Structure 1
Amino acid sequence: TSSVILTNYMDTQYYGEIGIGTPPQTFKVVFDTGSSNVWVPSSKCSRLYTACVYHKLFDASDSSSYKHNGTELTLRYSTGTVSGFLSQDIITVGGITVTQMFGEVTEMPALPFMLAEFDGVVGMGFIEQAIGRVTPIFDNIISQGVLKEDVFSFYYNRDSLGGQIVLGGSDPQHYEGNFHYINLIKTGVWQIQMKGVSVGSSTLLCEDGCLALVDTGASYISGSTSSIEKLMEALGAKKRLFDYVVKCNEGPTLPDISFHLGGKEYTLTSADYVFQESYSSKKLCTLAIHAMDIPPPTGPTWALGATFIRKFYTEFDRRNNRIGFALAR
């Protein structure tokens, strides 16, 4: 077992540090169970790409261990199609060193990569969804047969450690009660069946069922715009330019949102999904939820991000293709 300390940036971004190359080129990265690739901006990334001007660039010509590949990797992020090329090098993750192939982004839109406090993504997803079919970092750690267990866990603190990922297990110090596991529907994705979503006292959503992407990478909880337009209106959520809000002084009265997974009800009190910046009546306060129309095969599917994870310590169990959730502590 190895644990990676995470920095919690305004409850929207939880990222850690990986070292890449010889010598180790440090990168602040989000460990994303929603993606299966390692992406870091390339030193080859044109200075024109703003996301690159203000971010740690990986310089291959600075690493003695670098193993060129060149294979161009691409992925459209409904904001722009980012592109880089495949590269190989030793990546250190919480004391664990692994030869890992990753993408160096050479081209990527400002939004939202420009606002990232971190420089890259450590895809924790499955290889089934790894662009270029590149073997994921954790699959690469598993291969080492050093981890005490084929699982990694997430602890996203409620700001102020900012968070904590445990490679190989889970930290009892960060959850309480017991893990209630939901199985992974389609294998190859950290997604589980969801028996509806409730609003205070009314199962008026996801009725009949729906899918939930347990995305450690997503800042918020999301679902099809339909579900969110429904949900947000049912809360009194008055939509803004993008995210929905609600008068601060009225955030504490908003009803409890619950997600049904594994025969257990996962409730988010209003203090769980509202960014209670203040309690004034004049200022508006945002909700840790938004509409994310995720495209198939995985989508449409709700996505339980940091908002969800913050309250429920999460465990991604590979060996058993299931996800554990326990009261984050």
Structure 2
Amino acid sequence: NAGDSVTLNDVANVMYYGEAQIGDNKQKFAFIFDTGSANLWVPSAQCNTIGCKTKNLYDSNKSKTYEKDGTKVEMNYVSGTVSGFFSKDIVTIANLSFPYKFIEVTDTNGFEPAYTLGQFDGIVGLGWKDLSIGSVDPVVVELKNQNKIEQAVFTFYLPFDDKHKGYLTIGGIEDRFYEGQLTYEKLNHDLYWQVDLDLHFGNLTVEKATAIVDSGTSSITAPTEFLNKFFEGLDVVKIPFLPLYITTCNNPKLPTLEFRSATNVYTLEPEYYLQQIFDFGISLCMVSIIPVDLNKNTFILGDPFMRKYFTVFDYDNHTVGFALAKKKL
């Protein structure tokens, strides 16, 4: 149960990034690690677009272990659209080099404006394999298969705020990151890490909601209609044309969020979904609860929820685990 960690750098509580490497010469890139998708991708040396103009581009010419593939591919998100092509090379994460098949991205035009605004180069998928010929095993599964970790498991620890680092630990669950006992839940489908829940948000309930636990979303997200009802009488103001929700930091009306599994209960107090945004004359916060319409009743438990709950993702037992993150390491 010996773990292996990539340090995660926290920018303003909105995105967490870590470093990994590709190529025998070990080209460095910044990544979001995204439990929502399955591939590793990086912006290619031959990505022209404006977005790529600022990023670290992967150069195959300089890697003695590169191996052409050339298969064009296009994968999509909430985020949403991205295109390019498969390449094999040696990838290094935390300290483990392994041969992987990844995507060089040459088109990032439906990754705007998420991409340009961000200080990541590409994305490490920590999701589940596609049933397609021959999609790749996700990096953590591959590691297990190559016998480089003993368990196909990874955890997240995100620090309460700006002044401390976060951690993606691969291949072992480390006591240092939480208090009490992990609690575990069963998954319902295997596209991603999806959990069944009963939600109580202020006056609002939904029985049998499904929550994606997703490390690369910086908010709790919920269907528009339901979030519309959520905010009413809460004295939350939406900035027109922006996904931005502002309220007074000490708003006493703002409820503690409950999510109920079969046996368990997790709550999310205001303080974990509020980020101070302004401080002249009053303390003004953004609320990290935003509307995204996905499948029926589908909610995403992103960074705010994980800032409270250290979370374990076990491919091997098909479960997600939860416990109170330690306040200091």
Does the 8 A contact of 1:155 with 1:309 survive in 2?
A: yes
Whether 1:176 aligns to 2:179 is: yes
CA distance in 2, matches of 1:181, 1:115: 35
SS at structure 2 position matched to 1:40: strand
Aligned to 2:64: 64
Structural mapping, 1:84-233, within 5 Å: 84-109=84-109, 110-128=112-130, 133-159=135-161, 160-199=163-202, 202=203, 204-205=204-205, 207-233=206-232
Offset, 1:215: 0.3
Does the 8 A contact of 2:96 with 2:148 survive in 1?
A: no
Does the 8 A contact of 2:245 with 2:288 survive in 1?
A: no
TM-score by length of 2: 0.90
CA distance in 1, matches of 2:127, 2:166: 19
Question: In 2 relative to 1, CA 243–250 (structure 1 residues): closer, same or farther, beyond 3 Å?
Answer: farther
CA distance in 1, matches of 2:133, 2:8: 25
Deviates more, 1:283-292 or 1:22-31: 283-292
Offset, 1:189: 1.6
String of CA shifts for 1:223-242, please: whole Å, max 9, x gaps. Answer: 21122222222533222233
Offset, 1:69: 0.7
Aligned residues: 320
Offset, 1:18: 0.7
Question: In 2 relative to 1, CA 214–77 (structure 1 residues): closer, same or farther, beyond 3 Å?
Answer: closer
Question: In 2 relative to 1, CA 177–131 (structure 1 residues): closer, same or farther, beyond 3 Å?
Answer: farther
Query: What code does the residue aligned with 1:218 have?
Result: T
Q: Which of 6, 9, 12 matches 2:8?
A: 6
CA distance in 2, matches of 1:175, 1:225: 33
SS at structure 1 position matched to 2:228: helix
Question: In 2 relative to 1, CA 237–97 (structure 1 residues): closer, same or farther, beyond 3 Å?
Answer: same
CA distance in 1, matches of 2:42, 2:68: 15
Does the 8 A contact of 1:80 with 1:108 survive in 2?
A: no
Aligned to 2:319: 322
Aligned to 2:17: 15
Offset, 1:320: 0.7
Which consecutive unaligned segments of at least 5 residues does structure 2 have?
A: none
Query: What code does the residue aligned with 1:328 have?
Result: A
Percent identical = 35
Instruction: Name the Cα RMSD after superposition.
Output: 2.1
